Amino acid sequence: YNPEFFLYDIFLKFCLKYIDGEICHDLFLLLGKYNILPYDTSNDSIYACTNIKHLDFINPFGVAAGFDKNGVCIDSILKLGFSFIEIGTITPRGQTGNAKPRIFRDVESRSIINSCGFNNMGCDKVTENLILFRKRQEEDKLLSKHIVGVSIGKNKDTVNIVDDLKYCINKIGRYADYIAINVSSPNQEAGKLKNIILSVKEEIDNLEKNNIMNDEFLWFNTTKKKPLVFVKLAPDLNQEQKKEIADVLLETNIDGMIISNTTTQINDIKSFENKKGGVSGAKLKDISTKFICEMYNYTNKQIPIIASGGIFSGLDALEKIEAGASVCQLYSCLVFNGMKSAVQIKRELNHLLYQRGYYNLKEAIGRK
Numbered sequence: 001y002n003p004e005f006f007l008y009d010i011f012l013k014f015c016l017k018y019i020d021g022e023i024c025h026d027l028f029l030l031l032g033k034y035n036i037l038p039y040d041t042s043n044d045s046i047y048a049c050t051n052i053k054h055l056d057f058i059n060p061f062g063v064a065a066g067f068d069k070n071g072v073c074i075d076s077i078l079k080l081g082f083s084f085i086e087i088g089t090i091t092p093r094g095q096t097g098n099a100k101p102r103i104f105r106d107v108e109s110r111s112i113i114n115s116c117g118f119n120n121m122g123c124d125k126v127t128e129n130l131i132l133f134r135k136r137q138e139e140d141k142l143l144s145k146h147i148v149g150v151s152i153g154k155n156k157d158t159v160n161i162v163d164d165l166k167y168c169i170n171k172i173g174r175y176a177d178y179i180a181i182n183v184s185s186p187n188q189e190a191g192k193l194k195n196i197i198l199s200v201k202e203e204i205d206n207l208e209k210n211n212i213m214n215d216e217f218l219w220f221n222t223t224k225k226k227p228l229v230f231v232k233l234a235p236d237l238n239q240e241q242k243k244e245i246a247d248v249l250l251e252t253n254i255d256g257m258i259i260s261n262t263t264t265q266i267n268d269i270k271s272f273e274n275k276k277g278g279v280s281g282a283k284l285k286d287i288s289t290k291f292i293c294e295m296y297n298y299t300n301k302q303i304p305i306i307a308s309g310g311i312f313s314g315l316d317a318l319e320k321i322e323a324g325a326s327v328c329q330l331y332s333c334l335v336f337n338g339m340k341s342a343v344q345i346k347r348e349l350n351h352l353l354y355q356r357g358y359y360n361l362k363e364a365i366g367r368k
C-alpha cells in the first residue's frame with residue numbers, strides 16, 4: 001500500500017465509470033509522460049526473477065503491446081514496477097486506424113473489446129521516442145536492467161508483409177531488446193509465416209554486418225546484444241493449424257512465442273453484442289491458458305513462452321506458468337485493477353510460490 005497508488009486509483013475508478021476508454025488511456029499516458037505517476041522502488045524477490053534465453057527479466061511482469069503504441073510513456077509504465085514493456089504494434093508509416101470510439105470496456109466481466117486498426121505515429125517517430133528513452137535509461141537508476149520490446153506489423157494495405165517488417169527492424173532494431181512479430185490482430189500459411197520469421201532474423205543480423213562499431217555500441221538497448229525474436233499468435237485457430245505453426249517455430253529456432261492475442265469467439269457479453277473487434281480481459285483467461293498448454297505440447301518445451309492475457313492475480317499468473325509460461329504480460333489488469341497492478345500481482349505471486357513449495361519461479365514453469 002503506497003498512498004500515491006491509492007489516491008490515483010480513486011481518480012482511475014472514476015475515469016472508468018464515466019469517461020471514454022481511449023480518452024482515459026491517453027490522459028494517463030500523458031500523465032506518465034510528464035513524470036507524475038507513482039514509482040515502485042522496492043526490491044524484487046530474486047526467487048521470482050526469470051528469463052527467455054540470455055534475456056533476463058528482473059520480475060515476471062510486463063505490459064502488453066497496444067498500451068504504449070508510440071513509446072511516449074515508457075519510463076513511467078516501467079517504474080510502476082514492471083520488468084518490461086512491449087511497445088507498438090508499430091507500422092512503417094503513420095496510421096489513424098479505425099473510426100472512434102473504437103475501444104469499449106465492461107467492469108462486470110473485466111473485459112475489453114477493441115478495433116483500433118493499428119493506429120501509431122509510424123516507425124520514424126516511434127524510433128525517435130525509443131532513442132530518447134534509451135538515453136534517459138543510462139541516467140536513471142530505476143530503469144537499469146528494464147527490458148523494452150518492440151511489436152512490429154504491417155500497414156492495413158501493405159503490398160507484402162515481409163518488406164514492412166524489414167523497414168521497421170532497420171530503424172528500431174538497434175534499440176529493441178527484442179522484436180515481437182505481430183500478424184495475429186483480428187482487426188498464417190505455414191511457409192508464408194516461416195518466410196517471415198526467417199526474414200526477421202536475417203534482417204536483424206544485417207544490422208550487425210553493416211555497422212563498423214563493436215556490438216557494445218551496436219546495441220543501444222538493455223541487453224547490448226541483438227534483439228531476440230518473438231512471434232505473437234491469435235487464439236482463434238484449429239487444433240490443426242496450431243500443430244502446423246508449432247513446427248515452423250521449431251524449424252526457425254525462434255527465440256520465443258507470445259501466447260496470445262485477442263479473440264472474436266466470444267458472444268456472451270450483453271454490451272459487446274453491439275460492438276465489433278477483438279476481445280481481451282477475464283473471459284480470455286481460460287481460453288488463453290489452454291492455448292499455452294497446446295503450444296507447449298506441440299513444441300516439446302523448446303520454445304519459451306510469454307503469456308497473455310486474462311491475467312489479473314498472482315493466481316491467474318501462476319496458472320500461466322505452471323502451464324509453462326516463462327513470463328507474463330498485462331493489459332486489462334491496468335485498466336480494471338489500476339496502477340497497483342504490478343505491486344499487487346508481484347506480491348500475490350511471491351506468496352503463492354512459497355505455499356506451493358516452489359524454490360524459484362523457474363521451477364514452476366511447465367508443471368501441469
Ligand SMILES: Cc1cc2nc3c(=O)[nH]c(=O)nc-3n(C[C@H](O)[C@H](O)[C@H](O)COP(=O)(O)O)c2cc1C
Nearest residue numbers: 064065066088089114280281308309310311331332
Ligand atoms: C485497446 C487494445 C489495443 C491492443 N493493441 C495491441 C497491439 O497493437 N498489438 C498486440 O500484439 N496486441 C494488442 N492488444 C492485445 C494485448 O496486447 C493483450 O495481448 C490482450 O489484451 C490480452 O491481454 P489482457 O486480457 O490481459 O489485456 C491490444 C489490446 C487492447 C485492449
Ligand SMILES: Cc1cc(Nc2ccc(C(F)(F)F)cc2)n2nc(C(C)(F)F)nc2n1
Nearest residue numbers: 012015016021022024025028103112334339
Ligand atoms: C480508467 C482507464 C484507464 C486506461 N488506461 C490506463 C490505465 C492505467 C495506466 C497506468 F499507466 F497504469 F497508469 C495508463 C493507462 N484505460 N485504457 C482503456 C482502454 C481499454 F480503452 F484501452 N480504458 C481505460 N480506462
Ligand SMILES: O=C(O)c1cc(=O)[nH]c(=O)[nH]1
Nearest residue numbers: 116117118185187262278
Ligand atoms: O490495433 C488493433 O486494432 C489491435 C491489434 C492487436 O494485435 N490486437 C487487438 O486487439 N487490436
